[PDB]
């Protein structure tokens, strides 16, 4: 009921290898979250990887903006709950996507105690990360819908828990920085130093500059550059 | 004739790849500019039952190109021919 040509895959789900080998299967395995026949193709993401496959069908994933086998995203890399309830996502995402997803899951013969395959276990010989946290407990359908994620609340509270600015060069100038501070409020004493390519700004009672501390934790992206920010003295040292 | 032969073969059986990841891949797994991968077909053994007996696969959308007719304009014949 649903054939295609190429999978809508991730960039990490494909693998850390520029040449992989897919294997199309016309009408296999019955899509996880809509129960429809679709075109399953698996591959090997890299050496000693997990032989990843394709779960969520073409219309299933294309409609809801999500990858066919991890349900995170093609545009960002966040879950489908964070990218719906929550912008903040751009500083919340990551480049260089960890290949801790494409690895074999835990050898249950080892967990019981007698993994007979010895060193030849094509599974993975670590200990099972304890059951108690709800990141032992997520499923597919609750993940794929926005309703009830164990991950998305735990990453959504990373989004609200947690001055020497430099990296000026030839893009940042003094008037652009003081007008980007002018929307926050008024100055008391500002300066720009060019031997270290840095700027010093203050505020009446911080606060407004406090959300600048929310704005500039490797996050204030003006003039196409990730600016460098660490703390000032505030101690007359 | 080739299209009809393919359609008849489908009715009788019914009744590499180079894709550049130009979506999010910029620095994560650096070096993927063409993503040369091979896509083969799985050899299905001819001793197997069918996957199902019924399904609800939505093939496509019913919205077609509703363009105008552009044949002629509409009018009336006569006042007496209307009563005739």
């Amino acid at each position: 009921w649903e054939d295609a040509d190429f999978p809508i895959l991730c960039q990490t789900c494909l693998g850390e290898n520029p040449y992989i080998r897919m294997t199309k299967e016309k009408y296999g395995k019955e899509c996880k979250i809509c129960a429809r026949p679709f075109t399953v193709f698996r591959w090997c993401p890299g050496v000693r990887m997990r032989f990843k496959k394709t779960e969520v069908c073409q219309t299933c994933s294309k409609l809801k903006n999500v990858c066919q086998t991890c349900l995170l995203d093609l545009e960002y890399g966040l879950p489908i709950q964070v990218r719906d309830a929550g912008d903040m996502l751009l500083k919340l995402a990551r480049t260089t996507p960890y290949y801790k997803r494409n690895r074999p899951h835990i050898c249950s013969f080892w967990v019981k105690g007698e993994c007979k395959r010895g060193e030849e276990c094509p599974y993975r010989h670590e200990k099972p990360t304890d059951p108690d946290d709800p990141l032992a407990d997520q499923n597919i359908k609750d993940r794929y819908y926005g309703i009830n994620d164990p991950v998305a609340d735990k990453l959504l509270k990373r989004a609200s828990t947690m001055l020497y600015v430099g990296g000026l060069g030839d893009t940042i100038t003094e008037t652009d920085l003081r007008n980007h501070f002018y929307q926050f409020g008024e100055i008391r004493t500002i300066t720009v130093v060019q031997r270290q390519q840095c700027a010093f700004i203050q505020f009446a009672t911080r606060q407004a500059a406090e959300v600048a501390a929310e704005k500039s934790f490797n996050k204030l992206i003006v003039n196409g550059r990730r600016l460098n920010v660490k703390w000032g003295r505030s101690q007359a040292a | 004739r080739v299209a009809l032969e393919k359609s008849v073969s489908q009715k009788v059986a019914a009744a590499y790849i180079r894709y550049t990841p130009s979506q999010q891949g910029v620095a994560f797994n650096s070096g993927a500019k063409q993503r040369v991968i091979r896509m083969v077909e799985m050899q299905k053994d001819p001793m197997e039952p069918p996957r199902f007996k019924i399904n609800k696969k939505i093939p496509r959308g019913p919205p077609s190109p509703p363009a105008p007719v552009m044949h002629s304009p509409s009018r009336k014949m006569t006042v007496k021919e209307q009563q005739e």
Partner: peptide, 18 residues
């Protein structure tokens, strides 16, 4: 953006192994 290809089998697999 995906498209087909007609690429060298031997060198494809060789670079993969490498």
């Amino acid at each position: 953006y995906a498209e087909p290809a007609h690429i060298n089998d031997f060198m494809f697999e060789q670079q993969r192994r490498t």
